[PDB]
Amino acid sequence: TQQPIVTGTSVISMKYDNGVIIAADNLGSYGSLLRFNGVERLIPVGDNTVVGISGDISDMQHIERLLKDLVTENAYDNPLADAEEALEPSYIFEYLATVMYQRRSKMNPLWNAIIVAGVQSNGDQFLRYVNLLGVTYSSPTLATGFGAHMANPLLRKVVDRESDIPKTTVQVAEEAIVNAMRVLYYRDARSSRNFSLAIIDKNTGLTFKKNLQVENMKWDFA
Amino acid sequence: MTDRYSFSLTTFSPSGKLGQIDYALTAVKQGVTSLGIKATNGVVIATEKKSSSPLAMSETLSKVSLLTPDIGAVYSGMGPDYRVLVDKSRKVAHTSYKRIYGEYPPTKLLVSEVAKIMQEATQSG
Amino acid sequence: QFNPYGDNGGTILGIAGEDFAVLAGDTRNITDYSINSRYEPKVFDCGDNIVMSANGFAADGDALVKRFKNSVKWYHFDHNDKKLSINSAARNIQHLLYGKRFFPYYVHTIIAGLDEDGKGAVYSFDPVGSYEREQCRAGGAAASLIMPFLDNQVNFKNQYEPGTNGKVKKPLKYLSVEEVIKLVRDSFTSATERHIQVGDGLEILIVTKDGVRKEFYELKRD
Amino acid sequence: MDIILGIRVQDSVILASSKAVTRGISVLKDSDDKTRQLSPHTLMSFAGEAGDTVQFAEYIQANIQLYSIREDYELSPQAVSSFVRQELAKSIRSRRPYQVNVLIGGYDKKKNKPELYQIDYLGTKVELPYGAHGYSGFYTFSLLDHHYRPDMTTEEGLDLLKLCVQELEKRMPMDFKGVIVKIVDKDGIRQVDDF
Amino acid sequence: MDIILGIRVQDSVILASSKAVTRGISVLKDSDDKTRQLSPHTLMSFAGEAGDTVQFAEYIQANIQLYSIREDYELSPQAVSSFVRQELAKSIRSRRPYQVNVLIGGYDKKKNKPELYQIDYLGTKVELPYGAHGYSGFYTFSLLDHHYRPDMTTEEGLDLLKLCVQELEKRMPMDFKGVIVKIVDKDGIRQVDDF
Amino acid sequence: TSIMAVTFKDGVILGADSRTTTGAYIANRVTDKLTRVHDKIWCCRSGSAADTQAIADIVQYHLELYTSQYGTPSTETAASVFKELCYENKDNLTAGIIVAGYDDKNKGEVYTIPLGGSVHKLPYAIAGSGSTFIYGYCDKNFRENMSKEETVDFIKHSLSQAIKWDGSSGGVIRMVVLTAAGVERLIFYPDEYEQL
Amino acid sequence: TSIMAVTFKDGVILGADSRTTTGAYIANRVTDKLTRVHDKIWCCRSGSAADTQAIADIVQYHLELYTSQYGTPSTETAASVFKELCYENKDNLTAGIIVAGYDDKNKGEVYTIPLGGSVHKLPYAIAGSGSTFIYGYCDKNFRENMSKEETVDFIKHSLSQAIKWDGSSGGVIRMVVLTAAGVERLIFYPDEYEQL
Amino acid sequence: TTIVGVKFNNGVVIAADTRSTQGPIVADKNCAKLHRISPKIWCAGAGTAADTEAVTQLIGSNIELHSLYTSREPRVVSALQMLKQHLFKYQGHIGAYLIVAGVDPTGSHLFSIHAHGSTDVGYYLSLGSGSLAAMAVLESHWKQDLTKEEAIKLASDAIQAGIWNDLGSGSNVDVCVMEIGKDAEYLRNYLTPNVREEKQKSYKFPRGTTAVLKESIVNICDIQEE
Amino acid sequence: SDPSSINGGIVVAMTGKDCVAIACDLRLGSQSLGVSNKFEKIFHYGHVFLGITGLATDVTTLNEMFRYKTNLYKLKEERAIEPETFTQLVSSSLYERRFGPYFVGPVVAGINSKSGKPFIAGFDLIGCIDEAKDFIVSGTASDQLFGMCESLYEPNLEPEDLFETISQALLNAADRDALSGWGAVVYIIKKDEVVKRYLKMRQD
Amino acid sequence: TTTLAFRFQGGIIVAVDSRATAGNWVASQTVKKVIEINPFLLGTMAGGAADCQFWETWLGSQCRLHELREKERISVAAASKILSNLVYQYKGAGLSMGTMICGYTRKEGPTIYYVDSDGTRLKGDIFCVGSGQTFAYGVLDSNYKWDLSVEDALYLGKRSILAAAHRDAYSGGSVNLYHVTEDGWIYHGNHDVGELFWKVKEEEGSFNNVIG
Numbered sequence A: 001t002q003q004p005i006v007t008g009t010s011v012i013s014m015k016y017d018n019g020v021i022i023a024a025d026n027l028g029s030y031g032s033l034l035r036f037n038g039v040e041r042l043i044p045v046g047d048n049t050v051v052g053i054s055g056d057i058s059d060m061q062h063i064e065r066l067l068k069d070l071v072t073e074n075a076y077d078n079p080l081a082d083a084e085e086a087l088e089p090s091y092i093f094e095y096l097a098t099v100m101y102q103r104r105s106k107m108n109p110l111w112n113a114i115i116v117a118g119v120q121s122n123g124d125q126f127l128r129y130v131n132l133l134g135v136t137y138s139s140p141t142l143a144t145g146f147g148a149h150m151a152n153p154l155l156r157k158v159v160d161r162e163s164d165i166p167k168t169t170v171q172v173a174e175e176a177i178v179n180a181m182r183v184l185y186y187r188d189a190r191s192s193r194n195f196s197l198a199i200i201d202k203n204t205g206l207t208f209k210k211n212l213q214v215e216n217m218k219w220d221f222a
Numbered sequence B: 001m002t003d004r005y006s007f008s009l010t011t012f013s014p015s016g017k018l019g020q021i022d023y024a025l026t027a028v029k030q031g032v033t034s035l036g037i038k039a040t041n042g043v044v045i046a047t048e049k050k051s052s053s054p055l056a057m058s059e060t061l062s063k064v065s066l067l068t069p070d071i072g073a074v075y076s077g078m079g080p081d082y083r084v085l086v087d088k089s090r091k092v093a094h095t096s097y098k099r100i101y102g103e104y105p106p107t108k109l110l111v112s113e114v115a116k117i118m119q120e121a122t123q124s125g
Numbered sequence C: 001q002f003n004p005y006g007d008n009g010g011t012i013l014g015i016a017g018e019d020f021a022v023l024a025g026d027t028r029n030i031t032d033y034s035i036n037s038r039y040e041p042k043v044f045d046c047g048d049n050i051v052m053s054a055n056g057f058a059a060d061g062d063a064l065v066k067r068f069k070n071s072v073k074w075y076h077f078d079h080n081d082k083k084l085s086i087n088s089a090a091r092n093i094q095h096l097l098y099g100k101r102f103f104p105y106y107v108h109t110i111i112a113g114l115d116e117d118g119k120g121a122v123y124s125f126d127p128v129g130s131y132e133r134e135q136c137r138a139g140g141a142a143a144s145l146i147m148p149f150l151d152n153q154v155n156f157k158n159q160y161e162p163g164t165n166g167k168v169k170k171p172l173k174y175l176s177v178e179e180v181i182k183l184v185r186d187s188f189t190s191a192t193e194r195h196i197q198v199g200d201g202l203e204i205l206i207v208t209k210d211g212v213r214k215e216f217y218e219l220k221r222d
Numbered sequence D, E: 001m002d003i004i005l006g007i008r009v010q011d012s013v014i015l016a017s018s019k020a021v022t023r024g025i026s027v028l029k030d031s032d033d034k035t036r037q038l039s040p041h042t043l044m045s046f047a048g049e050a051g052d053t054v055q056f057a058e059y060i061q062a063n064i065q066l067y068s069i070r071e072d073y074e075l076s077p078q079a080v081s082s083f084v085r086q087e088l089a090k091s092i093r094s095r096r097p098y099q100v101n102v103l104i105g106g107y108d109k110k111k112n113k114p115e116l117y118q119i120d121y122l123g124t125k126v127e128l129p130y131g132a133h134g135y136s137g138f139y140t141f142s143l144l145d146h147h148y149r150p151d152m153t154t155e156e157g158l159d160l161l162k163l164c165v166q167e168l169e170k171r172m173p174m175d176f177k178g179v180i181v182k183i184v185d186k187d188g189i190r191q192v193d194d195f
Numbered sequence F, G: 001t002s003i004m005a006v007t008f009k010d011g012v013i014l015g016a017d018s019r020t021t022t023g024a025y026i027a028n029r030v031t032d033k034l035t036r037v038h039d040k041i042w043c044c045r046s047g048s049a050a051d052t053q054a055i056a057d058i059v060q061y062h063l064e065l066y067t068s069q070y071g072t073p074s075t076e077t078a079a080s081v082f083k084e085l086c087y088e089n090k091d092n093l094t095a096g097i098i099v100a101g102y103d104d105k106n107k108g109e110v111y112t113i114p115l116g117g118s119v120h121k122l123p124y125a126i127a128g129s130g131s132t133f134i135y136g137y138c139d140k141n142f143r144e145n146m147s148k149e150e151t152v153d154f155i156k157h158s159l160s161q162a163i164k165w166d167g168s169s170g171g172v173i174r175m176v177v178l179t180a181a182g183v184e185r186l187i188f189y190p191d192e193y194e195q196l
Numbered sequence H: 001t002t003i004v005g006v007k008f009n010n011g012v013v014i015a016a017d018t019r020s021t022q023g024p025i026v027a028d029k030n031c032a033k034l035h036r037i038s039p040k041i042w043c044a045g046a047g048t049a050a051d052t053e054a055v056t057q058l059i060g061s062n063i064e065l066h067s068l069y070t071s072r073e074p075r076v077v078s079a080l081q082m083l084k085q086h087l088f089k090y091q092g093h094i095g096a097y098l099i100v101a102g103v104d105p106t107g108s109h110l111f112s113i114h115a116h117g118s119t120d121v122g123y124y125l126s127l128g129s130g131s132l133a134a135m136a137v138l139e140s141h142w143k144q145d146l147t148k149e150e151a152i153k154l155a156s157d158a159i160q161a162g163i164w165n166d167l168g169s170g171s172n173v174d175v176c177v178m179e180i181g182k183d184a185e186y187l188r189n190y191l192t193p194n195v196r197e198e199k200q201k202s203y204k205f206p207r208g209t210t211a212v213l214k215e216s217i218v219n220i221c222d223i224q225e226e
Numbered sequence I: 001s002d003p004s005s006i007n008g009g010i011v012v013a014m015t016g017k018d019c020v021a022i023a024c025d026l027r028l029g030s031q032s033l034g035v036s037n038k039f040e041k042i043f044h045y046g047h048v049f050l051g052i053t054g055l056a057t058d059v060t061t062l063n064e065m066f067r068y069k070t071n072l073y074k075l076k077e078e079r080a081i082e083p084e085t086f087t088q089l090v091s092s093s094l095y096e097r098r099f100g101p102y103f104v105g106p107v108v109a110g111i112n113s114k115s116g117k118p119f120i121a122g123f124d125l126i127g128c129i130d131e132a133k134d135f136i137v138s139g140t141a142s143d144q145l146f147g148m149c150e151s152l153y154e155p156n157l158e159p160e161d162l163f164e165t166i167s168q169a170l171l172n173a174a175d176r177d178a179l180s181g182w183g184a185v186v187y188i189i190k191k192d193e194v195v196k197r198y199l200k201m202r203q204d
Numbered sequence J: 001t002t003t004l005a006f007r008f009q010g011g012i013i014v015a016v017d018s019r020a021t022a023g024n025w026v027a028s029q030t031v032k033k034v035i036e037i038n039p040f041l042l043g044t045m046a047g048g049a050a051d052c053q054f055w056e057t058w059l060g061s062q063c064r065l066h067e068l069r070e071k072e073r074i075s076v077a078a079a080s081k082i083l084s085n086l087v088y089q090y091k092g093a094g095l096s097m098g099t100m101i102c103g104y105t106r107k108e109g110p111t112i113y114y115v116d117s118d119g120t121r122l123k124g125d126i127f128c129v130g131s132g133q134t135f136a137y138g139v140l141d142s143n144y145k146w147d148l149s150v151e152d153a154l155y156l157g158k159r160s161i162l163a164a165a166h167r168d169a170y171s172g173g174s175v176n177l178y179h180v181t182e183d184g185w186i187y188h189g190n191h192d193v194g195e196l197f198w199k200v201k202e203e204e205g206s207f208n209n210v211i212g
């Protein structure tokens, strides 16, 4: 049992016709002190997976090292490490989900909420959540912390059920994600203007966007 | 200070008369005429706006007053006494009825409450 | 202080017919006043014509189902591919649950299938492994809303034959699979109206001698 | 205090109340009478917190005696029980509530009927053929449910009461030092001096 | 459990132990024998937490019986009491201590003397002419202090014991359902079947 | 909350952020924390929003009744009324108020009333959760008898840093200028002050 | 405690106050909070004195054994060893450590390890109870590639303000300069920095 | 509960969902959360339902008497001042969280008020368990100079976000539009997107199914003549 | 310890075509101990019916209080109180004890004598009115009653059909609650006749 | 819950109710509170359902191993002590158990041991355990004789559970009866309390307080 010290806020994500999008801001809070302003909370694994992490940053850095070690280990005595026997999003998630549940079962959790976003070998979209309790679930849109309360309602207006996914383009999905990040900046006291966004597409691969900013803000009416 | 008049100012005379009530009725007699007529589908109340001066704006002096949305009142006698009774009648319609039953009082019961206030000014100290 | 438990809501229902059994559950997953997923499967085909659901804390639920599925696999390895009978599965699940008697799986487990005479069977478990064969059992959030209705409409409790005035009970005539499914759907429709954690979708698994079949129905999403 | 029982038979009400008074470690008395006569045909037994029991009982007694003198009339058992209930219902929301449970056994001279009322410290009143307070009912009600008849004589009521006390003496951990038994009927109130 | 008494007279040790076993609300048994024979001339009575009492007593019994067989010799009462004390002194600093208080009544065949040892759950041992555990001493010791003589016969010891039990039955709130009485002397251990 | 008041050559200026939080949720991102109790006597509020609004309303009432009887009150008098309420009800209040005003006789004055209900007359004052992060900056950069433009820059830069580090502070920077010329309201948006 | 480390053109400088308190009593007014773990790798300690001393001694041991086998360790390696101890024993430690070092390949580097045991590489870092009061000042005044004299002035002015407002900080300002030229110790007394 | 308030061109609109709950159980599926303080001053309440109703009716009552005394139509700032001073006095023990909106001779107004007595001003506000879902919609689509039709659309969309995403909210959308120089129009069940589907079975019993011990006529009439 | 579940019991009310029904169990207990099987929880003042669940001393007190108040109402108004008016009186009376409340769950049922319209209403312990068109439930088996009513109820049932529906709702709900049962009563209410029926049920 | 067991001339009668509750909520009316340890031994369920089920099935396994090893039926004394020694090992950990281990052997005759989760092991003639135990004791104590017939003893056990089911809110559903002989136990059916109550009321004349 511990308490989180340096923390990261919401991670938000959704599925679209050809893949998945995931986003998270670049802040590491120390209570109400906005201490660290250049923290990357989206961690890519290969060219098919991005793991987004909120909560305790020290535990995030530990998980980041586990994933780095996972890639090294998979390459050992594996001639098809960059082909048929490369790490899948589903492999990476199941490993993390195992670790999270084991750690909570020893009463020593990794104090995080994690979203694994990626595209499988057969082109299928992968999007699944796991947290400090080992609780897992999937949905066309997924979000952690404040994002769950404010981003999901907006993202669900675009993709409300499974049949909406093929009707949703990457432009519409990214637009919805970017708008949600603006809304979170308005209303979450532990958020920042600077964020990262990652698109994993079955055709164009992994696009990782750094140093994005919330723009087109309204205040005037004050 | 303190109100040291804790005794009745209206009392029975040897003949059984309550002087102050009789004299109050005399003040009413001097007052401007007001009337009321009940029809099958309504009631009308009316009075004269006896303007004290032509420079006075008699529209600002309301002799006919709304007590509830379905109850109105008019008077004859002392105007200021009427005005404060209207304030008390409006309030008692809420405190002793609307805040209890969630509806405005029936005419006879509001009348009863106003009557009780007037009775008490005839016996209280 | 770290709380190793959580409540993911959900409501499940098992009914044993004459030569069939159904295990149904809603597809909504929640924490507090938020929806995690509108479709997160809760009832699982575990092989050997056995269906299972462990409702309550979803992390413990997933862990138990996973360990039971594994137990079926190893039963085949160790005992010459012998079919695991529903009574044997039930006793096995008791030991899985009681193994964590002093740090329990926070779930209410129900399994369904056919016994060795081909008759419909439902077993019900408490969190620490006490179990019983039952004809009718609802579990989870809206169990208290559903069970009285089932007592009345399946077992004909408090119903007497007209004209006799309480002297002759309404006879307990056997229900078809179509009749049971009607009662399941009406149970969940009513539970959806009056319980905030019940909704989104209803998934029913039907077990006969021919195997396991699935049926899905929409529920109100508010 | 501890055990108080009541049973309404054909023509009378019988109240049985334990004799022990225990102050923690020692039994200070073994002949305590946990009852007060409210009027010639109305008896009230009581149990609860020390001091408050007798204080409440004597307060009720004084009030009913005052009514009797003012009106030159004995209130019905129903009327007395309603007065008592209101006093306890008033008490439960007071600064310091009376922690007192009572049984009221009375013979209504107008209706020519015995009546037994059970009232707890919250002001929860019920009219019963037989009643108790505390754990007394847990041991005795299964016997009363079996044997009780509305047309029982006073002697049969006393015999059923003896069976109840015997079961209490067998299975109860505490020694309540027996019971004082009193009968309320058309002729008034009397004590059974051998039980 | 509840009351255990002991008295050492001229030529014997007498142990008196209550018969009641109470599990909270109900008295489950009224004939329980709260004693174990450790050797032909050594008896141990016991009281404390449920389960641990019998578990401890039978454990001690097994150990003394083992010693008796190995050496073909009966340990002196003093030696047995020292063994028991050490076990309880060891127990009090354990993960979960034995919550058991004992009296050991034995006749030393070498010295031709009766001996009574009182040991509580902490491992506090004292040799006494008479002893008790719990609240039993509070009611009985003033009587024993007055009447006790070291040259009393067994019959006089039993009479003084009856007076002690009578005082317990009068002033104790709990019904302990009487006592089983056993005598330890040169001929061994026997039970007084009418008390 | 980040609030401050600064005296300068021509009078006094009050400054504040506009963020009101319930835990980590921003309940209002455009709050007005600069409150008028008299024509040229204003205050900055911190602590319980309910308490500080209640106090300010009572003060405004007191100074309105004072004015009807005795004419325009001094800034010291206003601070005294604030103090009386804060000190006497210290057990039931969580309020940190800065009082700022302009007289013609006394010119610009600033009084700070912290939690306990004590009064401290200062050349400038800072308060609220965000103020902790700018004690160093404000002490190094404050000068007496600054110009209007300098004081606006000092407050804008100071609250900019307070907003940057304090999660409980943010939104727009509001300012109210109190001089002989009258009362001027100023507002500065994030795109302006974040690039400072 | 007020501690900081700042990278500059020629390397890195560590700074610290010298006050150690037990409640309101100053147990030591001349404490040395700048600790050597290797020739040109030093650290600033904050939190439990027992914990941070224990950690530093273990790190010094680890880097001494590293050097005997593999040659001079990098500043990143030293920070990693600190982190490993802080992260794995987070339940039983109260330690906030800033690690600063000079390589010839990497030049001046600063790593901060807050309570949780996370690592953050920064151009400069501030920590300790007194650091809260100089977030605004340091953010406004820090520039990259400053000269030695400028960096000394930046640290001297920063810790001066931290000492001024924080009761838990005080005494002398100590500094350790890490460059290619070697290791230089500096000390600045109250009569010097209080008049800044 | 989800409640919102939105300012527009010539007035203000407020809306609310219609679900009231006891823990996880839905007590009433078509609750009325829009209350009238005066003809053209309306408010919506979240928190303790009895408190929101009681504090509305008390201030509404006193507002009516004040209107009669002063011969003037009630003002929103009067309702606001009376509400906050009442709530502050009870130190949050009256669990009323309200959005107050209305028109009066001064213009159109929109305020929020919390249980401890603090108040706010805004062009758009949301309260209740679904306030974060509602505010997400408001922050995404609100603009200056909204028309009446645009404001009604935005308000109901914000309530819908609460209905679908917040478990504490559900059923229907109620709306009230207060425009300057017009009667306030209360639109009860403005949207109805949650009608229950027809059941698979009728559960009407055969007559005589229930066992009965005794029957008797209950005298509800007064004591009779003769 | 929880005052609303010391004594146990349930009340349910339903509307039908030109009729209303209100029903209750007969149990009074002291937690696990059953004390009385004749504790009726439905009362009437003229043609207005009031069911009350919860702490039994408050049930009795409130009945006496509303008898008191409706008697004075009648003397002054010269007419019997209506269900709509009485509902407001119950709410007013409960809220006056806001910070020391009666631990009860009242239910009002009746037909307006002038309009003929069927009326039901429910309250929490502090006076908040639930005016449902279909049904109102209250007591220690309210969850069970919600489940029964939601599936069994349909609008515009005839008086004798409504009796079966409400009876089966009560009975089966009570049989899933330890603290409810021990007998039951059902009132069928029409504009100028009311029938009272005691039901046969299991006595455990 | 209400469970009882008593010794008599013809062996042992075991009678239990069928109700399980979670707070006020009646979870089940069809619970099996008699555990069939083997064809000769019975145990009763009270306290923790799982603890009783699990460890008394386990006891059956230990009894089976004993008779395989020793080629002889295990005594009730030995069987009960295996259980009591086991739960004593767990003392403090939070097991909840109150059970009667019932059997009839050659050397012992009909024997009942009350075994309990704090380590208690008591031999006795009549035991009654559960929330409704006091009600059942009343009927038992006033009607019990050693020389009861098997028919009358079975009824007494049935009637005593009914008494508890009526008064105790947490007892009811149905009554399960068993008769333990030297050649094994014999099941004597499931009896719905609802139907049983009215039947007993009419035939016996009892429960005059209740209208039927």
Ligand SMILES: [Mg+2]
Pocket (backbone or CB within 6 Å): C221, C222, H162, H163, H164, H165, H166, H167, H168, H169, H170
């Ligand atoms: Mg919803």
Ligand SMILES: [Mg+2]
Pocket (backbone or CB within 6 Å): G048, G050, G051, G092, G093, G094
């Ligand atoms: Mg330490």
Ligand SMILES: [Mg+2]
Pocket (backbone or CB within 6 Å): G163, G164, G165, G166, G167, G168, G169, G170
């Ligand atoms: Mg200092």
Ligand SMILES: [Mg+2]
Pocket (backbone or CB within 6 Å): I174, I175, I176, I177, I178, I179, I180, I181, I204
């Ligand atoms: Mg029941």
Ligand SMILES: [Mg+2]
Pocket (backbone or CB within 6 Å): I203, I204, J164, J165, J166, J167, J168, J169, J170, J171, J172
């Ligand atoms: Mg029962």
